[model samples]
Target chain A: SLARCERLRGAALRDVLGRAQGVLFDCDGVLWNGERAVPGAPELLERLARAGKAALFVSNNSRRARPELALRFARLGFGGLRAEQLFSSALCAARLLRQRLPGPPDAPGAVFVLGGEGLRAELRAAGLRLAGDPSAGAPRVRAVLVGYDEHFSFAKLREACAHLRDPECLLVATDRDPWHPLSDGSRTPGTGSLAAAVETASGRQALVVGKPSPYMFECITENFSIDPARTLMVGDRLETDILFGHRCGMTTVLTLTGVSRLEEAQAYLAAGQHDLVPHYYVESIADLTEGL
Target chain B: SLARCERLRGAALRDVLGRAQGVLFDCDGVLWNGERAVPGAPELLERLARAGKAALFVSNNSRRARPELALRFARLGFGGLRAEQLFSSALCAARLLRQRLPGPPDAPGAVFVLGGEGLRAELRAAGLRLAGDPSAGAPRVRAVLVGYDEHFSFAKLREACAHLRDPECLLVATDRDPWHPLSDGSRTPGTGSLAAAVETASGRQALVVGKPSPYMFECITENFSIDPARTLMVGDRLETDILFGHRCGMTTVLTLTGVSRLEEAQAYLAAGQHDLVPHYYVESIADLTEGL
Candidate 1:
């Protein structure tokens, strides 16, 4: 087989960008993995801007607040992206809980969090008064919110399980991915593990929200006043990003500079045979310059 | 309280005769107990004949085919009842399996029978074949049909369990009652025990073909043209029989001669706060003379 990965990538980039009206970009691994932006990322952003395409950054990782993420985007040479252009499942969960309960914005309620400061901050933002002592009583809890927490412990799991045992207590999780890989190639437990722990303990299921979950995409489309038919989602991960795009009825573009390579994409496509096949592929964001 | 188990019988003889469109008589201790007839059974048959009501003998027991059981009724003082008038979970399971797998009249698909000859006969009557050895490599086995087997052995259970372990095999039970009372005032495992065994082995729940499973009632109406609203269920057990009647929207008459007494009926009615309380109670068939 002749090495045609670059040629294939150029054709894919041209085809995907030609039909897309709005673009959804995943921040981690796709744009900048934690710190520095990927090579040719700025050029890709410039190409999209020159094409006058509307773009929003949607992330599964909810560690940083919208403003903090905006600052990170600015550091990556993205100066025009607004705070509302970003959507987080943790933020959606917070808003949902706030709308459900009628009380003071900061009423003391038990929240069983599996994830880190992202969930905690969002819970506070959602107006839930985090219960410092989970074992206080069943009547003390208002809801149970679960998400990714790098500092998750057995004690926290046990507390969440106990809280969820009460039939009246609400059970909600941020996402369903079992693991997400880091830029350094280390993988961490996703919201699915936390959901499993609570489900096993309480004998109940959780309402999951994140990419591949319709609520996040629906919220983005409804909030931005954009038509879903003309949307495209560009990301590195097939399971989370491309799958989410598929479910949302948006075009998907797979990038090779990050988590997956050209050969891996072909293999996965053959294996999964999912409805959300990538409309195009790119060697890197820089390939947009050569063809389009 | 003047308690007599023949209150419904008297009502049927005097008031409901020719008026009640559907008559449901309990089988277990009331009609035929495995191989013998109960006392005062002749008068009950005479009353049903005089009323010109369509009598359907219904039992939670999944054992025995209706045709073979019809022969038993003919030998016993009630020679007039047809095979079609008898409805049991055993018959329902066979009919259900036939409907699910459209097997030939003589040779049904290999079914791992979990109960006794009663279940075997029912399946055989419904054109179902048997599978003692799961790996004998016959045509596709449809399901595992469970019923009551008083003399159930460990080897039979293992075979049933092994068949149930296959993901494609359907698990079906005659009833979900954990135990049934014996004629000698002892308790034995009912179909519920085998149902639980298969459930545990396969990690799949069994579809029950007895009351208060609505599916059984639906089958009865479809097969034997019985209207639930006009049906009167006479049974000795308050839990299975009376609960079945209540859930199926039929009148229930609890008898003291069977599994429950008058005091137990009162206690059950009080605890559950059931709106459909038994319309009549009696001591035995002798009380039918009093016209309720």
Candidate 2:
């Protein structure tokens, strides 16, 4: 059943797992909460691997590069994870910039990025030249990239507006996560908040590059030909992850280790917001191990 | 006729001005642009005074205090202006904060402000203590005021959110202006952009104290007993000033010397968004002198 918001266990869990070819997982709240692995989350992945099911990680986090993200998995008791198996907003944003920006191999138009050193690494790795780097010819900023910038200032916001006046300059945001919860339960402002400032000041909409936007799905398709119908999408957030799964025609499953709650899914179900209601739920990712 | 967007001239202009007891003028764009006064704008006010009509200034600018703003009028060829005639967002915001904050006079909850020194001065003058100031009894911040902050930073935004975590903490913005045109034709990001950031990051909506909000009108009403039917609202912008005028139940005149153009108003008229359409038009505020 679509948008059932049912608990996945026993006979139904086995039936669902039997038909699935793979599972796409959202990191940060599902597998772990920034420090330790969720109890048995790694074991669930191990079981999925034993069953010969494809498992991939997708994260809205733009603070870490693909290599660093893979390292995080190993440190968190997740083993045998390759860099190619991870998809971050940072990695996908770099790929998207290469697709749209002119002259990548040699003389590309520079991008004025509002992000961190890690995000910059992703762009540079994608063969895209940055604005402040020592370069010549067509150095005028052609794009403004909004990401998780801890040192964001009024000057940076003003500079973004100046570039946007050109009309042809692209405005792209990594994700629309308004605020993210920290390890200590405090919230840090996300890229979406900064994006709102830039959009309001410049009167331009940003092309979001993460979940809830179909572009992230397209980025994954380039790396793996995973079928949405036969794959299960697992995440803690109902808005971005579940909506994305519904839009991609994938069966969405909610894990209770993250941002969203089962009550929210039920509320959406009551509201008839099918896109927001997940197909099934588990108390934690470890519960999925029972099916395998 | 309401929202006709017609040129105010000949007998109709005289009849409209004759019925009015006062005129409310938006300062930055309508009366002057920075250093230089709009030609004959001062003369229009001079004639209004001679005709026994009250002339008051209402501005969304949060950059200057009421006293300093009044000084600007004298410097820019507008003479005999009193500080009481000037109602700036800085002034109204201070008033709003004073009303909402608990324990004023001897002891009041401090306000965490995001604005310039000028704006802070207004808040201090309103008998409201500010966060980060020395000598506090009940030191906890009870409000977050968003204004025209040129030195806005991510750290400040984070601190503002930290205070806003309390459900009782009030979030107030001086205005919702997106951007304002500089003397050199470049645009400076306005308080609206900064307000957008705070709203998104904190998951709170701001109580706007300036134009398009009836609070500003109510603030004006506290000092003067002018009836809306007998007052003319004159300004350069369509979205804020015109909409404010319409919402206040006054006659709105579109002055072409500022942000909006005639074509845009006609477009709004065609789209049936009457709130954004003005009742009359003039090439400049100078043209209003003839009707007086």
Candidate 3:
């Protein structure tokens, strides 16, 4: 875990930063799309590191491991980023599962996962054992943790249903998004399909951990010594990240580089729709320099 | 019809001795069940007739045709009651539909039917033609009117979905109850099922009629000649009938022969939940004495 944290520290040496309680960067659009980093992103991180400012990448996409995220940052240009400073909804789900597990490690709880290897790894690291092996003899699954998984199968759905059939087995989802938009405009399936399948089978609702829930915000607050009021949450989406910021009692700034558009935001504000309004609108993270 | 009124007069000779500006009778449990009438219910007409009171059954159930209901009463017992004195949800629905129907009845409007024959009859009476026929081509239904229909089917569900697919359709439900308890301890489907089905199909909500909705009471006051203050609503259920009466500025009385039990009535009073308290609680119609 320390080694992973060291790798993150190496990565954050590249990104831009300014003065505040701490900066919370989003992974998908703010950083690299997949393995490729956004241009000049690393230099920004190095600026933050040079300023002795604290930073963390908060991601709703729970498909990646903390170490993988740290590895990605290191591979990309932000070398000063740490694994402990990285918060993923998948990690939150794992923490929740570990809390819900019955008995001790020898009697580890069975979890029907509808997510990626990162989710499985997080659960294992949290001391919750997997029940995928058939030799486990009608393994008593205690919970269902669903997140984003490209290889999500009907068998995983069946396993989730089997566990959810037990009233005590909790059904948890990292997020309720049906699709996650990529920087290139392509979309992929989110955890919403898995949530639907499990809900239909078990007649139970999932406890979501991502943005808009404030659970992950609470978790990050618990982990760090940062003041929520002084913090500014900058994101590209109004429904998710901006709303999340507003919910957490922090100032929110929406960048036009991703998801939501200016016309939609204007119409939304004009209609007096949402209670959580963004404090500022910027063209991109580059505008952060002009304001601060 | 005169005979029926005369018969009501004869029955009410000793029961209700004085003439009144208006008379309010309960519907459903008091008047008829679906298409069937209660045993010996004709005596109500005779009682009303002898007193020469202006008889009006102020039913919370805004389903069934007023004229057809009068015919039902004639078949059941009250041959003396007139159609002018009858007020049902069918009348309310018909008036609403007539107000919302566009242009002439030359083309079939896209009408989503929720309730049974009563709702259908009311819709047709409002000059709205059905949409399913090939001669109609693509019928443009503009309004939805729901009522109490015991024989609800998937066809009704599909029709509701078709009309509601366009946000322009005005959605309305006759009542909110999905189930109503019968005299013999059996439960029957109510308009709430139709509302629920439509809501699920179109992901759109509706305006509810009948008890709890102020519009229904307003319609009654506007349509009838009775003063809201002097009107006494005698019913079995406190929540719907008594609450409606209270909200409409009328005296309310609960009867034991209905859905709510005695304990519930006491609890409601003790909890101070009512804006207008019931004047009396009687065992049944037999226990009712003239003059509050």
Candidate 4:
């Protein structure tokens, strides 16, 4: 039998906070909806910090670098968060490539990036050589890294396919999120959609280094020395966030502020898929802050 | 027991040709390689015409309209063929939509196309109203038709996704070919790759209207009154061309001038998957016209 998520309220919520030494939150729906921060999100972070708990924003979005994200946090009134406290898929991807590629960190090999400037920045910051412009000439690339790219084109797809034909070239994807939810409740095709195209064309599957793979969590745990047993993963999506936390051996709290509904969690439990079912459930992350 | 494809030669080749009242040729590799026509390809078509046999060119390439394809045939010295004698996936898609959508042919509903001018022209020629520009405003689309498009961008993907959100909007694909072979023998991402992205994002599978579906064959046989038993599908690829012909209950001849090799067809026969095994094999279409 699968365990159902306990509805956190009052004393139970406070007890959870006291036990959790480290708190990891999914940025988009749990922290903010699009550009606007969720109500009481800043106050909740402040409360976590005041309680001597380490707080980190773990996001699957690879569109923005840490500095830009820190600025985004400042604009949202959750200011003063250091770059080290932010963990994104882009950073995880770079780190994963660094470990897998055979070279010193400073002399890391080149990669063909199918993503935005954030992914590029992270790869470069990690001391990896970035491949040249597609127009210039074919760069000697060891890997093809894919993330959320709005500028994904046929030309780029062809280039990636050409690289994958070598078979020695590694294919990496940031996340397998099929769609990204908008603030308006609508969704757009996400990085997974773009990656799927490349996968189909190349006839090769990508090594996903983001959520549900434990790579992002591994990055956080390695840097902060946070024990999974004492850390709580708070997120709105069950598939990515909750499953990721569960796989990483951390407690998970599902908030209804985003993609997954409460009924969906119950359905997962009914289906005997306990790993996907979160340990706790709240109407919203703000619910946990009630009577704090 | 699965029957192996008999290698066509001399009397065996002439005997098969005598029975095939309709001869269907797969373009690109079978009739021509890149810009140049295959040896005896023009003569084969002339011989079929001289014998008062129905000859049609069936191509999975959705990049050109009938008039354009007819011009291509004319350039290759197989002129005087009517537009109806040619079948492209783009044409099949438009015709399929015409039958599926509500209302008369002239009043056929609009479709949101994720393709180029070739697909656009075919849909318009079928007396269907094409959807408005995605940049302009939302168009009332009854179907979301996908084809090979070099200009397939994020905007187009998003628009297609939006239209498909309405479950009523039929999702149709020109073909599911993962890669399109280039003139230089290099392959690029094809319509199937793009369709895979949309399918992943939309959580809806597309109804393939191209090769292996029998839709194009249905369109041809319905128009020309050709019996499947007497129709011979000639092509270089076993997967798309031969499998399609086999599925349609037509005699299929595999030419070794394209994608699939002889060993691959042999492997399918060895596996006892007789449906994929072609009825006959030719070194090239030129062999079929050896003594014509």
Candidate 5:
């Protein structure tokens, strides 16, 4: 209530770190951008672990499954990242479909997926059947899942709509991140773009599975005893990560190594869009390590 | 304003027809559905000619050039229709791009069209150069036009975004008709779906050039001095056709032989969505001829 987007350093940083039980970190722009980790990001996580503060990775990226995500963390010089510490939209979507898709044990309805191998793998791990897989019996399509697919086509969109014509068929999406910044500074069209096409073509809204949806929070909270009040949400993007933090009642910290800028957070504060305003900000996670 | 969604027959129908200067018919579902003309639709057109009333055809279809569209009209048994009387979205999109795209006449920037052969032909007919054409010099892309593209793919969408990254590159759509009903009762995904994808991927709003947008009205009115107050807008689709009529101040008539039904109209009336509610209803254009 005092102020927003305050610089978190000195005594204030130490006080906030001392009070927080854990931190939810958005992986991409926060911990690393491409193959390179943000300078001192690994040290912050190590420091958090030593201080008995939990660290959980929450990623909207549907491109990698949990195991691969954990591998990425290890490869990026982050120490002691358990696979369970990772939660991707792909994994959450699979968990959701496992509960939501209606069927008996033997004849469960298949899902028509507009995604890739990692997303498909996550669904298979959840015991959810895919429409594209060959089976002995043809089961009715239960849901259409939109994810990042490099091979997305008009024919696929038409088929998705055809399956969606059956009113009971569920429409799900990984995230509504329209475009993600690539290492080359060019943007890669995200799942939201493909989902938009499917939604427009089918006249249906997609049930988004990632940040700002609260579904991701539910997925994370399902396995761990996490308190939003004492937890800090740290990420680079103000739209999804900062907004999700506010929605979940967590104090948000925007790092400068990613998609959003300091000016954008200032603009949000100026516009009275406090939900998108991070409570505190740091140049990098290295600053957070100072408190530990 | 007095009352709406009235059944037009006998005295009411004759009075409306006698006072009208012209009529605008939505081609696909109004005059013809697929390859076959609606029963007595041809007779109604002939009767309008005999009654000395001007009749213009306005279609949201971007699949055919005006020449091909006229041939289809003749093939379907609709008598004596002029190509000039037709204003498909494809034709009007070309018209809009011709005026809006920046450059000198000799080196007007090329349009990167996400459409079919017919839509491209229309663009060429308007003297606008195409992006795909191998010219002497590689002219810069100035616009991306979204239409009913059967071969639309992820690569094409990515390429569209590449062009759209330039802020001045105009994004234009033929229409926002989500899906059109085929004769087999299945829906063929429309231009709006592709446009939605482009907009989401590129973060741009398209200049929609078809029904309900009023741009189509501007295109139609550019050649003819027709008053909307004295015109009867007859079509089957309430969303595009009826809404377009209301936007243009025309007396909207719903023929219950295509996409929307009487129940949907009644529901819109009950819901006080007067813009989507027709001023009159008929079983088909067969009932429309009785007035003439």
Candidate 6:
């Protein structure tokens, strides 16, 4: 059954790459692992740029801002990438809030933030006022935005719960990444863990504006005016990246250098979850650069 | 219908009390809200003790040791209560570890504790070794025990996740109470919230040893040799105390002084969730003291 799916190799792979107008890559596992870039990744991006194929970075990690991400990419030997070339879940969450709320972007409205500096920066950058700061006195917010917050505490949870109890208060989250992978092959609790805590306490389900939700894909597709059928999503995880691309009507490629293994993808294929199965598989993102 | 369940008023209430040789009471909501005891709570306990009925306190709050709890009871005018008469989830977890592990009590097997001093004291009292202290070099333990920890942090969660990744490591929790009730009618994240983070990251379900598990009820019943049919379990929450009683074959009473409300109980009855429906309910436990 796994053989039914296309393996991106030879002339067929080149033909598909030729037809692709916009290519989106999932960070962390696909392009790089932690601080180290995957071998041939820089060349792959350079090849795409040289070929005039629009390449964008889409990641579920909400801990860093676009400028920091660009810096990291630069450090990894990929240069000239602008903030607008990246679409992060933090930015997606802020965009979602602006679209969901009734008021204009510049209007004074409060968003209760339960996340770190990246989320805070994006929300502020989107022109949404933040509540729950001690200097701001008692918490009174129109919506609650949650992300990867290392400073998550009981007090913040209590404040978030209080805001969520309001029927009109909107609940929003970045990605529901359950575990954040580390460089040493270990894992730690991620954004979903903190979001789940608030969800459990508040009895409210947050609108996740990250991968697997199609909001980020919508942003990329709409911003770049790329046809979903002609776009390619290269990612490492089957659940988030592959599923997100498949749901968005784009071609999905699964790489083995990240969270999901070949056996797991094959199992997903065997289970007849066609949407979860990627359209193609590669050993790594670097494999696409083999003959470039 | 909910009407078929006893309302616990006048003669019907007195007759049920007369048959209860041993009674279990859930603290926090049934007896006291916070630092203040409920009206007529002291008199009700005094009445029970004066009539030669044995009363025990069962609480899911694993924040305090028995001696501290006994002191709180004394401060509320219910003095002379022994430590053995109180059963906490912390103690239940310690006892559970003792029963599950195949070693003598004095053996030096370690447990990773992610809770407060109460749980720490009980685990030590039960002669189980503890790990996960920051002052220590690194966290290494045979089992992971989760309870209410006000000082929960990302570092602690990461440590717990690391321990839980070991297939041989056992995951035990005090309870799955999502919210802890505050005096001002608000809620905060409880032990279950922290436990859930570990569960999400580890993909392992925790063995909850608190109310509704039948473990605490078994401890109370077996230690006291009380007939379940003749005993009464009084509590404020239907999900924990009342369901626990129903499962143990004991009569259950719902008091409106804590987490659950009458309409919620009525709705549970309406939904035909028979196990969750209590056998009796009162406006408050203080009502049973009326006309006695």
Best by TM-score: 2
Model 4 misplaced regions, further than 4 Å? A10-19, A102-109, A133-138, A290-292, B1-6, B9-15, B50-53, B102-109, B133-139, B269-274, B290-292
> B-chain TM-score, every candidate?
0.81, 0.97, 0.78, 0.93, 0.97, 0.93
Residue-wise C-alpha lDDT for candidate 5, range B1-292, written one tens digit per residue: 6337899999998999999999999888888888888888888888999999999999999999999999888999976788899999999999999999977777689999999999999999999999989778378999999999999988899889989889999999999989878888788788889888889989999999999888888998999999999999998999899999999999999999888999999999999999999999998889978888
Worst-scoring 10-residue span by lDDT in model 5 chain B: B1-10
- On lDDT, the leading prediction is 2
Chain B TM-score (model 6 vs. true structure)? 0.93
Ranking by lDDT: 2, 5, 4, 6, 1, 3
Candidate 6 error regions (>4 Å): A1-6, A50-52, A101-107, A132-139, A290-292, B1-6, B10-15, B50-52, B101-107, B132-139, B290-292
Off by over 4 Å in 2: A102-106, A136-138, B103-106, B136-138
Question: lDDT per prediction?
Answer: 0.66, 0.91, 0.63, 0.85, 0.91, 0.83
Q: What is the lDDT of candidate 6?
A: 0.83
Give a tens-digit lDDT track for model 6, residues B203-282: 78899999889999877766787888888899998889888888788888899888888888888888888888888898
Q: Is the docking of candidate 4 incorrect, acceptable, medium or high quality?
A: medium
Shift in Å, residue A131, candidate 1:
2.4
Q: Model 1, range B55-164, lDDT digits (tens) per residue?
A: 77777766567777776678776776777778888888888787775446555568777677778877887767777644433665668777776554434544555565
RMSD of each: 14.7, 1.6, 11.3, 3.3, 1.6, 3.1
Q: Write the per-residue lDDT of candidate 5 for residues A1-292, one digit (tens) a residue.
A: 4339999999999999999999999988899999999898888888899899999989999988888878988998887888999999999999999989876777799999998898899999999989979878367999999999889998999999999999999999999998887898777788889999999989999999998788999998999999999999999999899999988999999999899999999998998888889999999888899987
* Alpha carbon lDDT at B83, candidate 3: 76
Error of 2 at B151 (Å): 1.0
Locate the minimum summed-lDDT window of 10 residues in model 2 chain A. A100-109
**lDDT tens digits, residues A1-292, model 6?**
2324567898878888888987899888888887888898888998988888889889998887777877877887777787789999988888888788544455455898878887888887887678855453143478988888888777788788888778788999898888867999789788888888888878789999998898998887677788888888999888899889888888889998899888888887888988788889898888887534
lDDT tens readout by residue for model 2, B1-292 = 4678999999999999999999999988888987889999888888999999999989999998888888888999999998999998999999999888754465568999999999999999987889988873448898999999999998999989889999999999999999888998778899999999999999999999999897889999999998999999999999899999999999999999999999999999999999999999999989888888
Model 1, position A131, has a per-residue lDDT of 66
Q: What are the runs in model 5 whose C-alpha is more than 4 Å off?
A: A1-3
Output the lDDT of residue A113, model 3: 76
